[PDB]
C-alpha cells in the first residue's frame, strides 16, 4: 500500500529511488504510522539485493541482553538478525532506544564487517545493507550522551525524512476517501456517500499523532458507525473511548 501525491512525499520516493542501489546505510526519520518500514522495504526491493532477505528488528521491544543476542546471535546456535540478513537488507526500527552497548557493537559490525565470536568459533563475516528508523532527534541525543557520536557519524550516510500527515494536508482527504471506500466494500455498502463539510473540518484540523495508521482506523470506524449509503458521513469518530 502506497498512497499520496503531496510533493513532500513524492520527493521522498524520488530520493529512495536514488538511494536504493547503494550499499550505504540509510536513516529514516518519521513519526509513528508514516510508513517507515514500507520505505525500508522499497529500498530493499529497488536495490541489487532485492532477491536477498529483508529482515526487520524493533530495538525498543527487547531488553538489553535479549536485543544483543537477537541482533548479533549467540551459541553456548542462535543466528542473529545480521546473519539472517546476509546478502540482503536489515531494518532496525526505533534505533534511538538501543542501549549504548548495542550501539558500540553495531558500529563495530558496520566498520569491520564481521560478528565477534569466541569460545572456539571463528568470527562471522557478514554482508548486510543497513536501514534504520527513529523519530528521535539523534544529534540532540549525541549532545546528551545517550547516542554515540561515532555511530551517528557513520550510520547517517543519508537521511530520509518522512512528512507527518498534518504536513501533507492535501493527502488527508485523498487517503480518507480511499480508506472509506475500502471499508464500504468490507461491510457491503453500495457506494461511499461522501464526507460532509463538518467531517472534512474534523479530519483536516486533527493533528494525526498516529498518522496514516490512525487515519485508516478512524475512517474505517466512522464508516462502520455511519453504516449507510443514503446520506453523507458527518460524524468522524477520532476517539472511540468517548461515549
Ligand atoms: N504510502 C502509504 N499509502 C497508504 N498507506 C500507508 C502508506 N504508508 C503507510 N501506510 C499505512 O500506515 C500503516 C503503518 O505503516 P508503517 O508501519 O510502515 O508506518 P511506520 O512509520 O513504520 O509506523 P511505526 O513506526 O509506528 O511502525 C500501515 O497499515 C500502512 O497501510
Ligand atoms: Mg515500523
Q: Which three cell numbers stand for residue 31?
A: 513519526
Regarding the beta carbon of 4 and ligand 1, being less than 6 Å apart is answered: yes
Collapsed DSSP state (helix, strand, coil) of residue 103? helix
Question: Cα 100 to the chain's mean position, in Å?
Answer: 22
The residues with which 130 forms a beta bridge, in sequence order, are 90
| Cα 161 to ligand 2 centre (Å) | 14
Q: Which of 12, 38, 168, 180 to mutate to test the pocket of ligand 1 (most atoms within 8 A of CB)?
A: 38
Sheet holding 54-58, edge to edge: 54-58, 89-93, 129-134, 26-29, 158-161
Q: Which three cell numbers stand for residue 162?
A: 518522512
Regarding the beta carbon of 163 and ligand 1, being less than 6 Å apart is answered: no
| Cα 7 to ligand 1 centre (Å) | 18
Query: Could you tell me the resolution of this structure in angstroms?
Result: 1.5
- Cα 12 to Cα 10: distance, rounded to the nearest angstrom: 5
Ligand nearest to the CA of 41: 1
Distances (CA, A) of 202 to 31, 32, 235: 21, 21, 9
- Cα 207 to Cα 197: distance, rounded to the nearest angstrom: 18
Distances (CA, A) of 203 to 47, 95, 137, 168, 241: 37, 31, 28, 12, 18
Domains and CATH numbers, the chain: 1-165 (3.40.50.300), 166-243 (1.10.8.60)
| Cα 93 to ligand 2 centre (Å) | 6
Q: How was this structure determined?
A: X-ray
- Cα 52 to Cα 66: distance, rounded to the nearest angstrom: 25
Whether residue 51 contacts residue 68, with contact meaning beta carbons closer than 8 Å, is answered with no
The residues with which 78 forms a beta bridge, in sequence order, are 74
Regarding the beta carbon of 81 and ligand 1, being less than 6 Å apart is answered: no
The residues with which 133 forms a beta bridge, in sequence order, are 28
Helix H, strand E, coil C: the string for 130-174 is EEEEECCCHHHHHHHCCCCHHHHHHHCCEEEECCCHHHCHHHHHH
Q: Which three cell numbers stand for residue 63?
A: 531488553
| Cβ atoms within 10 Å of 90's Cβ, excluding its own | 27
- Cα 206 to Cα 233: distance, rounded to the nearest angstrom: 17
Whether residue 155 contacts residue 190, with contact meaning beta carbons closer than 8 Å, is answered with no
Nearest partner of 59 among 98, 30, 27, judged by Cα: 98
Nearest CA to ligand 1 atom 2: 2
Regarding the beta carbon of 100 and ligand 1, being less than 6 Å apart is answered: no
Ligand nearest to the CA of 212: 1
Interacting residues of 157 by C-beta distance below 8 A, sequence separation 6+ = 22, 24, 25, 26, 27
Rg (the chain; Cα; Å): 21
Amino acid at each position: 500500500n502506497l498512497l499520496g501525491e503531496a510533493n513532500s512525499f513524492l520527493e521522498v520516493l524520488e530520493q529512495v529511488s536514488h538511494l536504493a542501489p547503494l550499499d550505504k546505510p540509510v536513516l529514516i526519520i518519521g513519526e509513528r504510522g508514516t510508513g517507515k518500514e514500507l520505505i525500508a522495504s522499497r529500498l530493499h526491493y529497488l536495490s541489487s539485493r532485492w532477491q536477498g532477505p529483508f529482515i526487520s528488528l524493533n530495538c525498543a521491544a527487547l531488553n538489553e541482553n535479549l536485543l544483543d543476542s537477537e541482533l548479533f546471535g549467540h551459541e553456548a546456535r542462535h543466528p542473529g538478525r545480521f546473519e539472517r540478513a546476509d546478502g540482503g537488507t536489515l531494518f532496525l526500527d526505533q534505533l534511538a532506544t538501543a542501549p549504548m552497548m548495542v550501539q558500540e557493537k553495531l558500529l563495530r559490525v558496520i566498520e569491520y564487517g564481521e560478528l565477534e565470536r569466541v569460545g572456539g568459533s571463528q568470527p562471522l563475516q557478514v554482508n548486510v545493507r543497513l536501514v534504520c528508523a527513529t523519530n528521535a532527534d539523534l544529534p540532540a541525543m549525541v549532545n546528551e550522551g545517550t547516542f554515540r557520536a561515532d555511530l551517528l557519524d557513520r550510520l547517517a550516510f543519508d537521511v530520509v525524512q518522512l512528512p507527518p500527515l498534518r504536513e501533507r494536508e492535501s493527502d488527508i482527504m485523498l487517503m480518507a476517501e480511499y480508506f472509506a471506500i475500502q471499508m464500504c466494500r468490507e461491510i457491503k455498502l453500495p457506494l461511499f456517500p461522501g464526507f460532509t463539510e463538518r467531517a472534512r473540518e474534523t479530519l483536516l484540523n486533527y493533528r494525526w499523532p498516529g498518522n496514516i495508521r490512525e487515519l485508516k482506523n478512524v475512517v474505517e470506524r466512522s464508516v462502520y458507525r455511519h453504516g449507510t449509503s443514503d446520506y453523507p458521513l458527518d460524524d468522524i469518530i477520532i476517539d472511540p473511548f468517548k461515549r
